[PDB]
């Protein structure tokens, strides 16, 4: 094997190069590699950020997901309430064993969603919250991956 | 050709996105292949290419993107900048993923 762990991750919530062909088909998922404590971590990531669903969400949507990253734009009130809707839907259709994390995101705007509001949301649902400074979305994935790694290690022995 | 393919037929060099340098494959992870495959152009139609790296499991890729299915094909693109197709996979063959050498760089 060429890695130590494989984590399946879901990236959810609203908020430059160009390949037209690729724009037309769309991306299914990406595979990325990171290192955590000298172990090699393979991430398989489905990202439906900036994507409104038309299709009704089922258990099949969240089956196998090991971690879910929930993103909203701190400048956008709709995008924050959108994460509250998602958290609701996850608690119903996704395994109660899935790791979850909320991300308050966003260069170039007035802050519309306060940090306290974001912190209070995480508290009400018992999951972690980051506002992405030198600290961004990559750091968030490292943290989510860290959390899945720790849980996973105990289970094995 | 040169210091590109080992005696065992493996890639001596890392495989990178030409446009952004994202690392697609580590050295020694793929086999050289001359199978003829059609890859749509990375712009605007495409090329019949016959030099590829053959990779036997999607999780061997260091960083790569997969398109949604086009019939039973999934195209490979750069994970970071999404430029592609840089490669090709037929879902009926679970253990065969091809990165075209013309569509990538080597370091
Ligand atoms: Zn790239």
């Amino acid at each position: 094997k060429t890695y130590d762990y494989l984590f399946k991750l879901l990236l959810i919530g609203d908020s430059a190069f160009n390949s037209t062909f690729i724009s037309t088909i769309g991306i299914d998922f990406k595979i990325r590699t990171i290192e955590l404590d000298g172990k090699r971590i393979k991430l398989q990531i489905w990202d439906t950020a900036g994507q409104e669903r038309f299709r009704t969400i089922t258990t099949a949507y969240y089956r196998g997901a090991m971690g879910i990253m929930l993103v909203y734009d701190i400048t956008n009130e709709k995008s924050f309430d959108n994460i509250r809707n998602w958290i609701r839907n996850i608690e119903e259709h996704a395994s109660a064993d899935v790791e979850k994390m909320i991300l308050g995101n966003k260069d170039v705007d007035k802050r519309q969603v306060s940090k306290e509001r974001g912190e209070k949301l995480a508290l009400d649902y018992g999951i972690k919250f980051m506002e992405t400074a030198n600290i961004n979305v990559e750091n968030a994935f490292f943290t989510l991956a860290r959390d899945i790694k720790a849980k996973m290690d105990k289970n094995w022995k | 050709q040169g210091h590109m393919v080992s005696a065992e037929g493996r890639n001596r060099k890392a495989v990178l996105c030409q446009r952004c340098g994202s690392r697609v494959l580590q050295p020694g992870t793929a086999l050289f292949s001359r199978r003829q495959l059609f890859l749509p152009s990375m712009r605007k139609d495409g090329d019949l290419l016959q030099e590829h790296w053959l990779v036997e499991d999607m999780f061997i890729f260091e960083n790569v993107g997969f398109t949604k299915d086009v019939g039973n094909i999934k195209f490979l693109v750069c994970a970071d900048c999404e430029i592609g197709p840089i490669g090709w996979h037929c879902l009926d063959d679970k253990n065969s993923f091809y990165v075209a050498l013309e569509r990538v760089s080597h370091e």
Side-chain angles (χ1 to χ4, degrees), chain A residues 118-134:
Chain A
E119 286 155 339
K120 296 299 190 183
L121 181 65
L123 208 56
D124 281 344
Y125 290 99
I127 52 158
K128 295 211 194 166
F129 169 77
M130 276 175 63
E131 206 165 39
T132 63
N134 217 301

Side-chain angles (χ1 to χ4, degrees), chain A residues 2-3 6 8 17-22 25-33 40 42-44 51, chain B residues 19 40 42 58-68 70 74 77 79-85:
Chain A
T2 58
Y3 57 91
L6 171 66
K8 291 179 154 213
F17 268 117
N18 219 138
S19 212
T20 292
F21 188 70
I22 300 318
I25 314 310
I27 302 315
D28 191 356
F29 60 82
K30 297 183 184 179
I31 288 175
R32 293 180 187 284
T33 307
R40 278 172 50 85
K42 205 73 50 171
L43 306 176
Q44 188 182 14
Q51 300 197 4
Chain B
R19 297 288 296 272
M42 315 208 281
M58 68 176 60
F59 305 114
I60 293 171
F61 282 100
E62 207 67 2
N63 301 280
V64 75
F66 285 78
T67 67
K68 307 209 193 287
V70 178
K74 289 171 110 47
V77 303
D80 289 321
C81 74
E82 303 178 1
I83 293 150

